[PDB]
Amino acid sequence: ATTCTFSGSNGASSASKSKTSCSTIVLSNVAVPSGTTLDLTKLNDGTHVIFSGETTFGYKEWSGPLISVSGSDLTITGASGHSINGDGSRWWDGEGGNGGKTKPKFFAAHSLTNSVISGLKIVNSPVQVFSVAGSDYLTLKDITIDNSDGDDNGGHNTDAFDIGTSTYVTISGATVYNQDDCVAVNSGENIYFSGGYCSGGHGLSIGSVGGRSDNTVKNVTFVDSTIINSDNGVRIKTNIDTTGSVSDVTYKDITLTSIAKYGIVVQQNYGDTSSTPTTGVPITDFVLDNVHGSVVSSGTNILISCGSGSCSDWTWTDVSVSGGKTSSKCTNVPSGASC
Ligand SMILES: *[C@@H]1O[C@H](CO)[C@@H](O[C@@H]2O[C@H](CO)[C@@H](O[C@H]3O[C@H](CO)[C@@H](O)[C@H](O)[C@@H]3O)[C@H](O)[C@H]2NC(C)=O)[C@H](O)[C@H]1NC(C)=O
Ligand SMILES: *[C@H]1O[C@H](CO)[C@@H](O)[C@H](O)[C@@H]1O
Ligand SMILES: *[C@H]1O[C@H](CO)[C@@H](O)[C@H](O)[C@@H]1O
Ligand SMILES: *[C@H]1O[C@H](CO)[C@@H](O)[C@H](O)[C@@H]1O
Ligand SMILES: *[C@H]1O[C@H](CO)[C@@H](O)[C@H](O)[C@@H]1O
Ligand SMILES: *[C@H]1O[C@H](CO)[C@@H](O)[C@H](O)[C@@H]1O
Ligand SMILES: *[C@H]1O[C@H](CO)[C@@H](O)[C@H](O)[C@@H]1O
Ligand SMILES: *[C@H]1O[C@H](CO)[C@@H](O)[C@H](O)[C@@H]1O
Ligand SMILES: *[C@H]1O[C@H](CO)[C@@H](O)[C@H](O)[C@@H]1O
Ligand SMILES: *[C@H]1O[C@H](CO)[C@@H](O)[C@H](O)[C@@H]1O
Ligand SMILES: *[C@H]1O[C@H](CO)[C@@H](O)[C@H](O)[C@@H]1O
Structure with missing residues (x-):
């Protein structure tokens, strides 16, 4: 049972060269090195x-990813005291991934099967952090993402977890401070998020759905989590004039604070x-169960923009959200739900 340690400025190189000879x-x-991927x-x-001490990256305008992992039955963890530091303020320019500097994506969790990622502490990502794709039976456990420095420092599009084309992905105990979605499920099946703390970002969202390779979202559960000081709490966004499916989505025991x-x-x-909402991406079997909290006064409690017939079978139990205005602009709200 071999064990290998790589360190410093040539570690990445040796790692990539000897990884298939090391059990650990x-x-x-x-x-x-700047412009390269930890492969x-x-x-x-x-x-x-095992991630130990402090991991750093050289500065350069490129698209990333900074880190890329793939494979089977993998275990990847962060040692006590470690940190993986993007020092994203080298890139933050207010324009995020839609302009200015080209900023690199952080972590490509692609083609992972039966694998666990836990205890990772990520600090100041240049732009989106976790890109999850084409993975099955993946666990993301006790992850901390602290991009709090970006709040008034031009951080934009710092999604914590972007998910697509994957199944049986579980996310538990995530702590997130960012400036965009805490979670965004673009596609996938049997996804479960519990015990999360989402601060400063744009909420826990399904979507954006449609206009991609895979436009199917099914069996997604958010539970026992807090969304605090964010633009939105609970969000489902489907792209206008696209086709797809959203079904079997549950938000349960959700706390909204200062939304x-x-x-x-x-x-x-x-x-x-x-524009009027279109009907190509129906949302059915949407369940809210014990979602409660506060919206600021210049905010809106609930807005539902559904197309004709494209939203049905919604079960809303114990929903108690207040502090904001009540929208007069909801459309085609399924029975049992309300604004
Ligand atoms: C909707 O998605 C749910 C969450 O993904 C899913 O529950 C999860 O189901 C998986 C697989 O059945 C369970 O994991 C099992 O299989 C692996 C492989 O050996 C074992 O290591 C595990 O111990 C377990 O036996 C998860 O435990 C389970 N998660 C939850 C939170 O209970 C539902 O099955 C999906 N429901 C529908 C209707 O599709
Ligand atoms: C590689 O070297 C480091 C330095 O001791 C160890 O921590 C590791 O377990 C492996 O031996
Ligand atoms: C970082 O730590 C490792 C431990 O084996 C060394 O191999 C390397 O030279 C650097 O000191
Ligand atoms: C190892 O070398 C790299 C690049 O030469 C530095 O960025 C690092 O700080 C260490 O000196
Ligand atoms: C990075 O450094 C290592 C040293 O082991 C080389 O093998 C690799 O090809 C790259 O130059
Ligand atoms: C990466 O690490 C290996 C040994 O761990 C060296 O042989 C190489 O020169 C580079 O420092
Ligand atoms: C990581 O880097 C090594 C050499 O640096 C390659 O051998 C490997 O295929 C990957 O590019
Ligand atoms: C990659 O790292 C391993 C560490 O044992 C070396 O054996 C190899 O020569 C390469 O530098
Ligand atoms: C542990 O696993 C590594 C590869 O994952 C082997 O190189 C080693 O001999 C041991 O089986
Ligand atoms: C390498 O070392 C790690 C931790 O020491 C083990 O979990 C792995 O199985 C391999 O022995
Ligand atoms: C990234 O920038 C560094 C400067 O520190 C170069 O060494 C590297 O070749 C890449 O352009």
């Missing part, structure tokens, strides 16, 4: 990866909210 690879204070791709089945814009928001006209 320990990354200690590795400084990743942890295609590890041997069962590999263990700035929308406590609960469902828009089937996402991408152009000045």
Whole structure:
């Protein structure tokens, strides 16, 4: 049972070169050369990866990812005291991924099967953090993402978890301070998020759905989590004039604290909210159970922008959201739900 340690400025290199010879690879204070990826791709089945000390990256305008892992039956963890520091303020310019500097994505969790990622502390990502894709039976456990420095420092589009084309993804105990979605499920099945703390971002959202390879969202559960000081709490966004499916989505035991814009928001006209919502991405079997909290006074409690017939079978129990205005602009609200 081999064990390998890579450190410093040439660690990334050695790591990529010897990873298939190491049952356990320990990354200690590795400084990743600018414009390169920590390539942890295609590890041997069962590999263990330990992040130790402080991981850093050289500065350069590129698209990332800074880190990339793939493989089977993998275990990847963060040692006590470790941190993985993006020092994103080198790139933050207020324009995020839609302009200005090209900023690199942080973590490509692609093509992972039966694997666990836990205890990772990520600090100041340049732009989105976790990109989850084409993965099955993936656990993201006790992850901390602190981009709080970006609040008044031009951080934009710092999504914590972007999910697509994946099944059986479980996210538990995440702590997130950012400036965009805490979670965004673009597609996938059998997804479960529990015990999270989402601060400063744009909420726990399904979507945006439609206009991609995979436009199906099914069996998603958010439970026992807090959304605090964010623009939105509960959000389902489907792209206008697209096709797809959203069904079997549950939000349960959700706490909303000081939500700035929308406590609960469902828009089937996402991408152009000045237009009537379209009907190609129906939302059925939407369940809210014990969602409660506060919206600021200049905010809106609940906004529901559904198309004709494209929203049905919604079960809303114990929903108690208040402090904001009540919208007069909801459309085609399913029975049993209300604004
Ligand atoms: C809707 O999605 C739910 C969450 O993904 C899903 O529950 C989860 O189901 C999986 C698989 O059945 C359970 O995991 C099992 O299989 C692996 C493989 O050996 C074992 O390691 C596990 O111990 C377990 O036996 C999860 O435990 C389970 N998660 C929850 C929170 O209970 C539902 O089955 C999906 N429901 C529908 C109707 O599709
Ligand atoms: C690689 O080297 C480091 C330095 O001791 C260890 O922590 C690790 O377990 C492996 O031996
Ligand atoms: C970082 O730590 C490792 C431990 O094996 C060394 O191999 C390397 O030279 C650097 O000191
Ligand atoms: C190792 O070398 C790299 C690049 O030469 C530095 O960025 C790092 O701080 C360490 O000196
Ligand atoms: C990075 O450094 C290592 C040293 O082991 C090389 O093998 C690799 O090809 C790259 O130059
Ligand atoms: C990466 O690490 C290996 C040994 O761990 C070295 O051989 C190489 O030169 C680079 O520092
Ligand atoms: C990581 O880097 C090594 C050499 O630095 C390659 O051998 C490997 O395929 C991957 O690019
Ligand atoms: C990659 O790292 C391993 C560590 O044992 C070396 O054996 C190899 O030569 C390469 O530098
Ligand atoms: C642990 O696993 C590594 C590869 O994952 C082997 O190189 C080692 O011999 C042991 O089986
Ligand atoms: C390498 O070392 C880690 C932790 O020491 C083990 O979990 C792994 O199985 C391999 O022995
Ligand atoms: C990223 O920027 C560094 C400067 O520190 C270069 O060394 C590297 O080649 C890349 O352009």
